[PDB]
Amino acid sequence: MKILGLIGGMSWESTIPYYRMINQHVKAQLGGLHSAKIILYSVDFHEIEQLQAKGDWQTAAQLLSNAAISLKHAGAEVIVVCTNTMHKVADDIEAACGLPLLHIADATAVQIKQQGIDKIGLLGTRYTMEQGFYRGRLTEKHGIEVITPDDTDREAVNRIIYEELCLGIISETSRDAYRRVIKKLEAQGVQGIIFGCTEITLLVNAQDASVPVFDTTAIHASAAADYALQ
Amino acid sequence: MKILGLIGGMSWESTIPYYRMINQHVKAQLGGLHSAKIILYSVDFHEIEQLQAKGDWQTAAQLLSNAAISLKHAGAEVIVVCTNTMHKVADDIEAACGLPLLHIADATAVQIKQQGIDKIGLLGTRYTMEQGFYRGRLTEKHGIEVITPDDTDREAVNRIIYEELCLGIISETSRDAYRRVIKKLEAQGVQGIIFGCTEITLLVNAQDASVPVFDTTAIHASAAADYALQ
Amino acid sequence: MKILGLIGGMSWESTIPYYRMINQHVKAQLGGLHSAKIILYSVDFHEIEQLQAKGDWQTAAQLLSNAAISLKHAGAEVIVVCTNTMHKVADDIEAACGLPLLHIADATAVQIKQQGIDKIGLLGTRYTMEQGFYRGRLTEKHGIEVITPDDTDREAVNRIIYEELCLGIISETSRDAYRRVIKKLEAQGVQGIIFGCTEITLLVNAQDASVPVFDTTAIHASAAADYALQ
Amino acid sequence: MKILGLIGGMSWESTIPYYRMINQHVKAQLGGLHSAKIILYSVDFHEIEQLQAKGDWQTAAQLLSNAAISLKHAGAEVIVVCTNTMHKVADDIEAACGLPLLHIADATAVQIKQQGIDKIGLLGTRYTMEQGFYRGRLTEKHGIEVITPDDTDREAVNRIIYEELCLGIISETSRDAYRRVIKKLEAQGVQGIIFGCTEITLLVNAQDASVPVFDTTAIHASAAADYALQ
Ligand SMILES: [Ca+2]
Ligand SMILES: [Ca+2]
Ligand SMILES: [Ca+2]
Ligand SMILES: [Ca+2]
Numbered sequence: 001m002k003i004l005g006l007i008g009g010m011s012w013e014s015t016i017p018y019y020r021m022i023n024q025h026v027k028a029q030l031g032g033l034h035s036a037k038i039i040l041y042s043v044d045f046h047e048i049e050q051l052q053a054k055g056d057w058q059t060a061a062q063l064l065s066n067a068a069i070s071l072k073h074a075g076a077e078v079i080v081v082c083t084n085t086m087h088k089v090a091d092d093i094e095a096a097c098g099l100p101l102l103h104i105a106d107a108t109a110v111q112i113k114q115q116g117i118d119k120i121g122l123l124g125t126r127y128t129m130e131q132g133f134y135r136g137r138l139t140e141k142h143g144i145e146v147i148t149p150d151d152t153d154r155e156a157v158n159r160i161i162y163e164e165l166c167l168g169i170i171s172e173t174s175r176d177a178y179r180r181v182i183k184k185l186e187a188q189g190v191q192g193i194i195f196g197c198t199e200i201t202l203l204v205n206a207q208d209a210s211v212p213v214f215d216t217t218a219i220h221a222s223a224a225a226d227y228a229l230q
Numbered sequence: 231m232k233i234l235g236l237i238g239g240m241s242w243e244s245t246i247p248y249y250r251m252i253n254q255h256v257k258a259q260l261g262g263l264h265s266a267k268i269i270l271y272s273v274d275f276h277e278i279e280q281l282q283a284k285g286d287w288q289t290a291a292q293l294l295s296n297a298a299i300s301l302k303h304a305g306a307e308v309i310v311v312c313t314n315t316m317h318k319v320a321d322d323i324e325a326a327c328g329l330p331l332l333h334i335a336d337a338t339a340v341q342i343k344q345q346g347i348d349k350i351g352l353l354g355t356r357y358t359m360e361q362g363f364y365r366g367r368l369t370e371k372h373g374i375e376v377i378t379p380d381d382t383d384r385e386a387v388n389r390i391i392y393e394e395l396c397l398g399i400i401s402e403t404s405r406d407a408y409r410r411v412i413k414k415l416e417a418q419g420v421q422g423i424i425f426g427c428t429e430i431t432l433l434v435n436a437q438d439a440s441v442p443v444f445d446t447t448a449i450h451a452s453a454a455a456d457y458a459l460q
Numbered sequence: 461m462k463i464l465g466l467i468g469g470m471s472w473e474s475t476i477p478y479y480r481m482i483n484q485h486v487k488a489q490l491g492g493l494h495s496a497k498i499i500l501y502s503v504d505f506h507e508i509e510q511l512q513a514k515g516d517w518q519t520a521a522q523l524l525s526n527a528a529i530s531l532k533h534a535g536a537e538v539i540v541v542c543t544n545t546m547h548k549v550a551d552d553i554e555a556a557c558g559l560p561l562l563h564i565a566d567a568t569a570v571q572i573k574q575q576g577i578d579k580i581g582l583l584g585t586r587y588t589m590e591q592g593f594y595r596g597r598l599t600e601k602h603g604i605e606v607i608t609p610d611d612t613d614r615e616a617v618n619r620i621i622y623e624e625l626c627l628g629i630i631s632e633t634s635r636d637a638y639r640r641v642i643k644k645l646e647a648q649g650v651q652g653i654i655f656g657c658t659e660i661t662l663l664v665n666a667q668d669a670s671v672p673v674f675d676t677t678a679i680h681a682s683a684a685a686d687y688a689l690q
Numbered sequence: 691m692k693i694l695g696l697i698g699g700m701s702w703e704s705t706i707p708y709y710r711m712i713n714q715h716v717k718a719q720l721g722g723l724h725s726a727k728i729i730l731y732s733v734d735f736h737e738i739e740q741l742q743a744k745g746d747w748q749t750a751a752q753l754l755s756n757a758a759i760s761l762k763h764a765g766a767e768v769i770v771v772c773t774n775t776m777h778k779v780a781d782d783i784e785a786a787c788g789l790p791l792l793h794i795a796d797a798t799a800v801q802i803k804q805q806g807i808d809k810i811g812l813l814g815t816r817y818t819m820e821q822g823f824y825r826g827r828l829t830e831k832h833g834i835e836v837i838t839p840d841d842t843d844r845e846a847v848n849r850i851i852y853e854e855l856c857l858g859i860i861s862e863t864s865r866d867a868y869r870r871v872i873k874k875l876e877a878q879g880v881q882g883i884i885f886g887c888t889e890i891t892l893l894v895n896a897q898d899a900s901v902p903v904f905d906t907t908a909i910h911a912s913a914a915a916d917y918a919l920q
Binding site: 380382397 | 707860862865892
Binding site for chain 4: 461469471475476479483486490492493494497499503504505509531533534535
């Protein structure tokens with residue numbers, strides 16, 4: 001099996017689901033007492049936060065790129081970034097370390113395609129919803145049309161993540177706001193909705209939509225196990 | 231802070247509490263969005279169990295040692311083995327990688343000695359209660375007298391962990407048995423009791439003892455965080 | 461005594477306590493060398509889980525119905541399904557085999573009513589807390605008022621069972637969460653609290669509650685023994 | 691997967707280890723969430739005992755045979771009798787139901803022969819050590835010579851199983867007796883030793899023998915799981 005290099009700690013709470021699910025998938029596929037071979041570089045989140053606060057994505061890219069190279073030295077054969085948003089620097093990481101990088105958007109696209117879907121709604125941080133790294137990749141690489149909320153609604157979705165969910169605040173009114181945004185996406189004729197942030201799943205679930213939901217973190221973890229065993 | 235190198239996957243389920251507790255300690259001490267700097271090498275448990283089943287400690291030590299060396303290449307400055315029985319080859323791993331290794335028995339011995347305790351009761355799997363790597367180390371290295379239950383009670387304790395607690399089964403007769411064994415250790419004049427694995431606390435806790443109880447796993451994770459921050 | 465037909469293997473770990481407790485109850489009541497007369501059909505959980513994940517309740521019903529008919533052929537006189545959520549198709553299983561089925565929700569309702577309680581708290585998976593087969597059955601069939609946690613707390617309770625407890629992962633923050641949810645239920649005026657699955661006991665127990673706890677699994681086993689002896 | 695028909699041991703405590711081990715083996719070999727398909731018939735020992743006391747051994751035998759015929763009706767494809775001593779009626783059961791019976795002695799014999807062994811020492815209840823059903827099968831059917839302890843040692847071995855080991859009592863003097871009996875078998879030139887029941891492993895194990903030891907009950911459960919998967 002391939003040794004997976006995970007870059008996490010952003011936050012450590014959202015890294016645990018990867019570690020759990022990759023291991024569960026490997027055990028299911030191989031049986032015995034098998035678990036995944038994982039080398040996880042868990043950074044101090046504060047360092048990344050200070051960089052984001054200064055808009056210094058260059059240095060943030062360097063920090064995670066260096067983690068990837070360290071994982072390569074340790075024997076990792078592929079890189080898995082355990083956060084949707086930090087894929088903002090995935091191209092930098094991949095170019096820097098020379099290992100394959102299992103991109104979260106590509107893993108989601110696989111499942112979307114498997115369901116025959118060509119038009120999807122997308123929820124996440126503003127970065128994830130607006131920028132080329134995730135939304136642009138679904139479309140330009142995989143030919144999937146992506147619909148996001150309007151600006152006022154993206155502001156609310158984003159604020160709730162950083163302001164509440166990230167701090168462990170799970171609000172009923174925030175849930176109702178997401179429920180409304182979901183209905184608006186569905187009104188645009190989307191065939192499914194991507195929950196493109198681990199924390200979103202703390203607030204809403206499959207019962208809050210009338211179309212298939214895609215939990216990108218869970219899908220990414222499953223994809224990572226599949227890759228290790230391929 | 232120092233970068234911690236964790237060797238886990240033995241099993242992965244028991245690695246999660248280490249990762250969680252170490253991060254929680256760092257957040258509590260440093261505040262803000264601080265998390266621990268951790269590089270975790272999670273091995274395939276099937277390989278380790280197979281070697282252990284053959285009594286091939288030499289190869290097992292080599293495998294863990296290679297993991298420790300990998301972590302060193304990635305930047306780890308200290309090694310924490312997130313399991314109890316593999317500590318049988320802790321001194322070999324430490325010598326092989328040239329990094330300090332925070333031994334699970336040593337971390338607990340420090341707490342016991344600081345509290346003035348010189349006679350301790352030990353509960354855990356049969357291996358932990360009988361073998362040299364944990365109990366022998368407390369005595370030979372730290373000068374602490376170790377009392378264990380009698381043969382009948384060790385068998386009962388061990389059976390309950392393997393056949394019940396490990397299966398998620400909580401029996402009220404088994405809880406009573408553990409309570410009785412604790413009282414028996416206390417009647418022998420122990421000044422504290424070590425819980426050698428986390429499974430024990432599914433049945434009993436400090437409320438069941440008149441002497442202090444030492445959760446060796448919890449102490450290990452706390453010692454790791456402390457070392458990283460010193 | 462009646463021959464009990466147990467349908468288990470969902471999972472096999474969960475079946476062991478039913479088998480043990482029923483036998484213990486019979487021995488306690490009849491004394492001497494008596495044990496229960498049990499015929500157990502233990503299914504392949506993989507088949508059930510796959511059907512459950514696809515929402516194919518019809519086929520799941522057929523599978524368990526065939527198990528029940530098999531037990532009838534072997535001489536069983538009553539059916540006990542050793543799991544909570546498959547009770548979703550209990551009425552279909554009962555009809556298929558023509559034997560009485562001792563429903564997990566009825567057994568607990570009976571204990572609640574005998575203790576003069578008409579307002580109860582309910583903790584369990586989201587299935588159990590939200591669907592008709594258990595929650596709705598307590599209220600509709602037995603006239604018992606059922607209070608469950610709010611949306612947020614239900615998500616947490618459920619996530620913790622699936623993501624942690626089922627894996628043996630005991631998290632103190634999770635323990636704290638359950639303790640708060642219990643106090644919130646009590647604040648609501650519930651006269652007792654049901655633990656819908658044994659996983660909950662891994663984290664919390666009677667000490668954590670100011671009201672009587674109803675372990676629906678233990679109660680189910682007790683009811684099965686009592687019925688056999690009736 | 692074949693459906694296994696298990697006939698419970700006189701004590702349900704003796705049956706649970708078969709259910710646990712078979713399931714663990716199937717999960718290990720197949721992965722997923724797979725568990726064994728087992729139909730277990732667990733009798734009320736009182737009923738058997740009462741018939742025997744009355745001197746009606748034929749009806750008592752018919753009762754176990756009846757259990758096997760019932761398992762056939764339920765769809766079992768092979769009979770597995772739990773415990774070595776129970777095999778005293780294995781021949782009767784097999785003749786009565788017409789299903790293949792996976793005999794504890796045959797499962798162990800093929801493992802012994804694979805190791806190139808043709809002379810073994812046998813420890814167990816006096817029944818197991820003296821009667822035809824187990825040892826006779828090893829010698830007559832498989833060509834394995836069987837050495838047993840002398841009469842005084844058989845009495846001791848037997849008493850210790852019934853009076854101590856079945857109750858989980860571990861006596862140092864009993865352990866010493868078993869160790870001596872092992873050396874006496876080794877002195878007779880045995881190439882391996884069979885532990886007739888798993889209770890024996892409470893006193894002695896591989897560390898006490900200078901020849902390979904065979905836990906025939908554990909081997910039996912392993913063989914049952916293996917056969918279900920063929
Ligand atoms: Ca231990
Ligand atoms: Ca001393
Ligand atoms: Ca204490
Ligand atoms: Ca025997």
